[PDB]
């Protein structure tokens, strides 16, 4: 009665592009070209696929299958599998809030850059502005110029002193106050995601049509543009030059594993929610396969889109694209690439489509990012929730805005690094390992192959059973152990993070998954009788 069965998706292509749109984001565009260039060049293509075939694809497919089979949220699905691990469904929620605290602000920057890209003369071309210093030296000026340790470029000046305004803060210690411009930008973004989420999967399935197809068009325009630029072969050479001695280093394998894990994004509850709304007899294998393989291919061509332009930039300057692509962060897009676009014909066009591309790269992923949590909460508190969806979605968008006010400060970029590298990563990897173990070693892999055999009509191959049993948990275990054994020393804009930053990162990191052990203790302490009977009634799913 009343609700009973849940709703279903409006078309196969909508869900196929929704998952693709969530999988593809900023990092696919710029993190993969950098990590591919600095870790063996073209030879990075070899371990990147292995970590996919053995690690990424099995988690992606197993998550999309569990989601499309059980049709439950990230929280209520554990009550029907392993109640003690229900805290997982909560942990991810908290995790999402941290991601949403910064991932949108980044887009805000692009948005503030987009609304600043409608002028006939781009603001970051000249030095006669209200934010430039006396060190600002630009081009279209007297030739012979020689760069100095204190000299700066109008683009670097525009990012540093105008939009980001990071010169007004001394670090994590002093970062206040808040920039109202980026607050309004992130409000507009939280509004464009509000009207794209508030109705449920209908609008995020109609809006995804645009958010997921535009980046390929923009990447195509930038691609055929950058291929025509003189001296673009240098960036391609630096992008594909095989350096097989890097493969001897045990670091590049960990870099590839981590990169393909985030980029694929299993273990976050997004694929669970997206798979939940679908036909029971609908095929899941082909969907997961195609989407992931596209997500990789798209990264691969994005590499060219970036390195052709950076090759042209190295030609205009003096070569060694590694020198011009030293900084691995937002500065590679907001300063370097932007300065390269400004010196091209129809600069307004390629700027509008570039920043618009960035925003459209971000939107689909935060759409999903919220979609998983919303689905989880609505499925965990039914009839206490779902009274309206707009109320909860609004409470989340607003919560993310107040959670992003720390990032909208002048030293907000500092917090972005802190949140992006020390907090979300190791916790998502941790909960992904816990989930992979619970589904593989608690619920039983044989019964899982039986559920896929019921849904798809055939039992999964031995390659996948042997992947879920041993290969995938060791795949996540390797990354977690590698990170925990040596957290990277953070540095951003000639500013090294204090030594206690990692403690703050761990505090944010630890505060996310306090619920899984405290919930195991909660259910283990609430259910009467012996601990063996409590863990037996707590590990085995509900019989009816």
């Amino acid at each position, epitope marked *: 009665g009343s609700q009973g069965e849940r709703e279903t998706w409006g078309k196969k292509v909508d869900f196929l592009l929704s998952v693709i749109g969530y999988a593809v984001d900023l990092g696919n565009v710029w993190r993969f070209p950098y990590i591919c260039a600095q870790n063996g060049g073209g030879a990075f293509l070899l371990p990147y696929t292995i970590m996919a075939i053995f690690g990424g694809i099995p988690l992606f497919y197993m998550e999309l299958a569990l989601g499309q089979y059980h049709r439950n949220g990230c929280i209520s699905i554990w009550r029907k599998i392993c109640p003690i691990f229900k805290g997982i469904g909560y942990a991810i929620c908290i995790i999402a809030f941290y991601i949403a605290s910064y991932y949108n602000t980044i887009m805000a920057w692009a948005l503030y850059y987009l609304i600043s890209s409608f002028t006939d003369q781009l603001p970051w071309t000249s030095c006669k502005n209200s934010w430039n210093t006396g060190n600002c030296t630009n081009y279209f000026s007297e030739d012979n110029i020689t760069w100095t340790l*204190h000299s700066t470029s109008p683009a670097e000046e525009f990012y540093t002193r105008h939009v980001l305004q990071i010169h007004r803060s001394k670090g994590l210690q002093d970062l206040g106050g808040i920039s109202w411009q980026l607050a309004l930008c992130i409000m507009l973004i939280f509004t464009v995601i509000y009207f794209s989420i508030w109705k449920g999967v209908k609008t995020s399935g109609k809006v995804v049509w645009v958010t997921a197809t535009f980046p390929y068009i923009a990447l195509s325009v930038l691609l055929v543009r950058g291929a025509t630029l003189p001296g673009a072969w240098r960036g391609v050479l630096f992008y594909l030059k095989p350096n097989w001695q890097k493969l001897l280093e045990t670091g590049v394998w960990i870099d590839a594993a981590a990169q393909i894990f985030f980029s694929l994004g299993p273990g976050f509850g997004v694929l669970l929610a997206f798979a939940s709304y679908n036909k029971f007899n609908n095929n899941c294998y082909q969907d997961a396969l195609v989407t992931s393989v596209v997500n990789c291919m798209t990264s691969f061509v994005s590499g060219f889109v970036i390195f052709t332009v950076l090759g042209y930039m190295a030609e205009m300057r003096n*070569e060694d694209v590694s020198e011009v692509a030293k900084d691995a962060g937002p500065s590679l897009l907001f300063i370097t690439y932007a300065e390269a676009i400004a010196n091209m014909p129809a600069s307004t066009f390629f700027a509008i489509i570039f920043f618009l591309m960035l925003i459209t790269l971000g939107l689909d992923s935060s759409f999903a990012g919220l979609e998983g949590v919303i689905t989880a909460v609505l499925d965990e508190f039914p009839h206490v929730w779902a009274k309206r969806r707009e109320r909860f979605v609004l409470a989340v968008v607003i919560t993310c805005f107040f959670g992003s006010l720390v990032t909208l400060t002048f030293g907000g970029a500092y917090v972005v690094k802190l949140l992006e590298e020390y907090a979300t990563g190791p916790a998502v990897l941790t909960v992904a390992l816990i989930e992979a173990v619970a589904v593989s070693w608690f619920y039983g892999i044989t019964q899982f192959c039986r559920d896929v055999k019921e849904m798809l009509g055939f039992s999964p191959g031995w390659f996948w059973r042997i992947c879920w049993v041993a290969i995938s948990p060791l795949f996540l275990l390797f990354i977690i152990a590698s990170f925990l054994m040596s957290p990277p020393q953070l540095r951003l804009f000639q500013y090294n993070y204090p030594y206690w930053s990692i403690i703050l990162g761990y505090a944010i990191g630890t505060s996310s998954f306090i619920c899984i052990p405290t919930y195991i203790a909660y259910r283990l302490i609430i259910t009467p009788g012996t601990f063996k009977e409590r863990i037996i009634k707590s590990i085995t799913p509900e019989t009816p």
Partner: antibody
Amino acid sequence: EVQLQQSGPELVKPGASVKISCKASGYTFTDYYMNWVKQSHGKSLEWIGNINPNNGGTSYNQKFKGKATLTVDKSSTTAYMELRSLTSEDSAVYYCTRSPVRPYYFDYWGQGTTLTVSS
Amino acid sequence: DIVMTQSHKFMSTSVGDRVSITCKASQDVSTAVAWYQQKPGQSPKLLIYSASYRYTGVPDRFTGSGSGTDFTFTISSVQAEDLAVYYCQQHYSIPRTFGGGTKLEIKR
């Protein structure tokens, strides 16, 4: 004008260490990278590494990693290079030369320091 | 790394003749080549930067040409005080390497 005055010649026994100074004048010391070029007897020039005077931002060569240590002092605008584990190959003339960030040329050099590693 | 190869270790010329020294690099360099002059007993002195551009305080008789991997340093009127060892050096990729050196001996 721009003058880079190094230390005098040094005769040191093998296995010891030696530090060479580099007093800069005639320009804004915090504006340019400070470099060290090794020139062997009858050989070519060999870039050892640079250092950023603002924070001591060193950048050594893979061939000199663990061989040379570059330091800098802003209070007196003077750079230093220390060499440990001295052998017969280190007996050469060392220069300290100023250089901008881009284009990375060596505009002004020091007079040189004749190093002799022998017992 | 980069290997700056100066094939001619020694070159003979006369006072007033046109002399040109060649510099061969490993990979493509575009226009990132500097020419230094080291007189016997003195420190190297920068003459050319970025293939062709002359530095401040350098006579007009010293020129530079080339665009790619092979570069040429040209002296139009050789003087008696031009007797020195000439070095070429790339300034694009880390690390910065030098050439073997061409001791220009004067024939009379």
